[PDB]
Write a protein that binds this DNA or RNA. Structure first.
Ligand SMILES: [Mg+2]
Lengths: 105, 681
DNA sequence: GGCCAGTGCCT
DNA sequence: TAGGCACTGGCC
């Protein structure tokens, strides 16, 4: 259920998606990133219908992260109506993420 | 003989005030100090020693003390003071001759820590005096709640300064006696502290007189400077800078920026077990922050718009734009294009020089073309660095008289070769390389306008012809009776060697021999036949087998050194000891040493012959030495007629040198006239 | 600062 | 493991 984005599909998949979208900027060589990966699989599976999770590998798609000023990874950006609602950096826990969404959803 | 030293307010270029001086007289064994109001008496004491036909010893006096006294006497006393060359001894010049196997700080211009090997103690103390006096002065003020500035330590005369001056003379005297205790250069039956100048130069080894004459002449050359076209180089800079901007634009579009981990402190540890993962990038673990802001009164809290969550680790990262100057960035991008590195540096890292970049093949067409843009970018940075942005760039060194006054260590290499620096005028791009014509054209006598008539000067470029091969011919003459020499100046030495070696092209020979003379590596030798390191060693063996005279020469030199050494040095043409690092390097050291010494005596004799013809040396005269780059000299001349006399005189002097050292191969020179270095070479 | 790995420019 | 300078990058 997780959507895999690219630099070129970003604008339409996220910015013009009318609905809440949780984006995850990651990289294969980051420890914390591989930590939250399993978590996200579960979240996308639970919030089906209410939310959409999408990942963007910053090494294969280097032109998007800069536009949002990424300073650390994994970075989670909650988009809603093409605008960034909330932001959070770090390998959150299955519980911590659950609170973050419900509170901003 | 007297030993002296002076303290003034600045370097030669801008000195204006005499602070103090100290003289130690061997005939009375006493130290006399002279304060500022004693300048006139100081000078009279020196001229007296000259009236007795005595000697004055200064440490680095050829480049500073002597020229400074002339200048200060005119400025402060409106007096003409000119110490004759024959009456001056310089312990720095002597040290560089006798301790040629060692490096030096060059009077504190170079950082001790960077120079390899050991340093002569007395010489080290003399070179560190300024920096030492400066630290004493600072603490002095720093203690009196005062503030330190630039180099205020040199603005005024004071007692600490005088004390250091006295110390410099006791050390210079110690160095002197240590240097004069060397039997190879100074016969033991003679007390050199109790002889007149003529005995001193005549009874010591010939290299002593030669090095002192070279130092004196080269100091004058540094003072003359090399006329430089500032505007031309500024216009060249603009052009290079624009090309750089454009190459960067194209390369940043072809290669995109990426993210790199940066700023991590804590180590990442496997959450499952606990096994630290040293390979993974460092992370960071915030201690503050949460989904909701801490409560402050059932009722839902106020969300925390903070980006971090206590206990939730992340990897700090930075954005990095492709830098064409970074060999790492280049290495990173070419692999990610299909490049498989072959050669690596002996420290974990793929080699990425122009040599290999030329052989890199990737599938992407645009990526493959970018490589040529990268090689161009690197070369442009090299040129921009040398002419305008480097710490030693030409535009940073040009003086108000429109000239660059580069430094020269007359005896900076073991072989007797000179070294150039600040900036190194011996490494200006040649006309055959990119932008070389414009760089070379900016240096030249045409950029100097005569002081009286305003007319540009003319330049004479004079080169010793195939000097190294002739030296080789000379040394093999005792084994072949001059046949090799006879062939060089009569037959065709290059095809002769082409047959000696198994080379397909004559030019291959011109390249082979040249590499052989400076002792090129087996690899480069192979790279001429196409092969590498294999055909290399092979050729060198085939060449010698068909050139017995060279093999005999190499065998007798080795007999001189090895019996485990019998002696670790070779005798130069002037009698000096030339340290030999390795037996296999003996021949190369011998040849390189001969050319260096011949070139040194040659430029010395040329100037002495011009001055005997009535020509005056300097911009206020008829000619000016501007550059000496090993086998070649660039001479500025007030007129074309004078340039013709210089060229002709140089040939006469070169012949005088060959005769003087009974050279078994005729020596020659070739001269060219023109307005600048691009045309005169 | 300085310190240093890698390279290139001149003979 | 030609011999000398000197430049830029990357680091503690
Ligand atoms: Mg001094």
């Amino acid at each position: 259920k997780i959507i895999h984005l690219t630099d070129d599909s970003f604008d339409t998949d996220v910015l013009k998606a009318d609905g809440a979208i949780l984006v995850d900027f990651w990289a294969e060589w980051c420890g914390p990133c591989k930590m939250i990966a399993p978590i996200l699989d579960e979240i996308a599976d639970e919030y089906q219908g209410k939310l959409t999770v999408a990942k963007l590998n910053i090494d294969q798609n280097p032109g998007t992260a800069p536009k949002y000023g990424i300073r650390g990874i994994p970075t989670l950006l909650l988009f809603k109506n093409g605008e960034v609602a909330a932001t959070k950096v770090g390998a959150l826990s299955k519980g911590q993420l659950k609170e973050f969404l419900d509170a901003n959803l | 003989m007297i030993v002296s030293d002076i303290e003034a307010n600045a370097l030669l270029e801008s000195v204006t005030k005499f602070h103090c001086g100290v003289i130690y007289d061997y005939s009375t064994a006493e130290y006399v100090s002279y304060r500022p109001s004693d300048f006139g008496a100081y000078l009279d004491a020196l001229e007296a020693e000259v009236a007795r036909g005595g000697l004055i010893v200064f440490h680095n006096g050829h480049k500073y003390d002597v020229p400074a006294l002339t200048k200060l006497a005119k400025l402060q006393l409106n007096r003409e003071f000119h110490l004759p060359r024959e009456n001056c001894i310089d312990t720095l010049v002597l040290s560089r001759l006798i301790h040629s196997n060692l490096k030096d700080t060059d009077m504190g211009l170079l950082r001790s820590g960077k120079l390899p090997g050991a340093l002569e103690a007395w010489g080290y103390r003399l070179g560190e005096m300024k920096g030492e006096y400066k630290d004493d002065f600072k603490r002095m003020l720093e203690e009196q709640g005062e503030e330190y500035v630039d180099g205020m330590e040199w603005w005024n005369f004071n007692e600490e300064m005088m004390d250091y001056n006295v110390q410099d003379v006791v050390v210079t005297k110690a160095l002197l006696e240590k240097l004069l205790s060397d039997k190879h250069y100074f016969p033991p039956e003679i007390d050199f502290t109790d002889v007149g100048y003529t005995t001193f130069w005549s009874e010591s080894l010939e290299a002593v007189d030669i090095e002192h004459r070279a130092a004196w002449l080269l100091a004058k050359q540094e003072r003359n400077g090399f006329p430089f076209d500032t505007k031309a180089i500024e216009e060249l800079y603009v052009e290079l800078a624009a090309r750089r901007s454009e190459l960067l634009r194209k390369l940043t579009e072809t290669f995109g920026s990426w993210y790199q981990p940066k700023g991590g402190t804590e180590m990442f540890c496997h959450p499952r077990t606990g096994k630290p993962l040293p390979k993974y990038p460092r992370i960071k673990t915030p201690k503050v922050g949460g989904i909701f802001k801490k409560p402050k009164n059932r009722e839902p809290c106020e969300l925390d718009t903070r980006e971090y969550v206590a206990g939730a680790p992340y990897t700090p990262v930075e954005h990095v734009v492709f830098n064409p100057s970074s060999r790492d960035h280049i290495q990173k991008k070419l692999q990610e294009a299909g490049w498989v590195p072959t050669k690596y540096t002996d420290k974990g890292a793929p080699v990425v020089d122009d040599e290999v970049l030329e052989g890199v093949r990737v599938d992407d067409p645009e990526k493959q073309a970018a490589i040529d843009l990268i090689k161009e970018y690197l070369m442009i940075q090299k040129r921009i660095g040398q002419s305008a942005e480097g710490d030693k760039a030409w535009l940073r060194y040009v003086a108000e008289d429109g000239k660059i006054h580069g430094s020269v260590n007359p005896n900076g290499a073991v072989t007797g070769r000179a070294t150039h620096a600040f900036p190194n005028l011996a490494q200006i791009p040649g006309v055959r390389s990119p932008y070389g014509e414009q760089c070379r054209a900016a240096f030249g006598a045409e950029h100097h306008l005569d002081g009286i008539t305003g007319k540009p000067w003319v330049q004479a470029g004079i080169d010793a012809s195939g000097l190294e091969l002739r030296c080789l011919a000379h040394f093999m003459a005792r084994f072949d009776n001059g046949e090799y020499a006879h062939e060089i100046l009569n037959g065709d030495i290059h095809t002769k060697n082409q047959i000696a070696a198994e080379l397909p092209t004559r030019d291959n020979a011109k390249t082979f021999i040249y590499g052989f003379l400076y002792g090129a590596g087996d690899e480069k030798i192979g790279q001429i036949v196409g092969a590498g390191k294999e055909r290399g060693k092979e050729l060198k063996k085939k060449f010698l087998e068909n050139t017995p005279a060279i093999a005999a020469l190499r065998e007798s030199i080795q007999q001189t050194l090895v019996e485990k050494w019998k002696r670790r040095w070779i005798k130069g043409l002037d009698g000096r000891k030339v340290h030999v690092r390795s037996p296999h390097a003996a021949l190369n050291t011998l040849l390189q040493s001969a050319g260096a010494l011949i070139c040194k005596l040659w430029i010395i004799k040329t100037e002495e012959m011009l001055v005997e013809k009535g020509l005056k040396h300097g911009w206020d005269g008829d000619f000016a030495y501007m550059a000496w780059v090993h086998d070649e000299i660039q001479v500025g001349c007030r007129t074309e007629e004078i340039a013709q006399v210089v060229i002709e005189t140089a040939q006469e002097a070169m012949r005088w040198v060959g005769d003087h050292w009974n050279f078994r191969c005729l020596l020659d020179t070739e001269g060219k006239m023109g307005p600048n270095w691009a045309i005169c070479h």
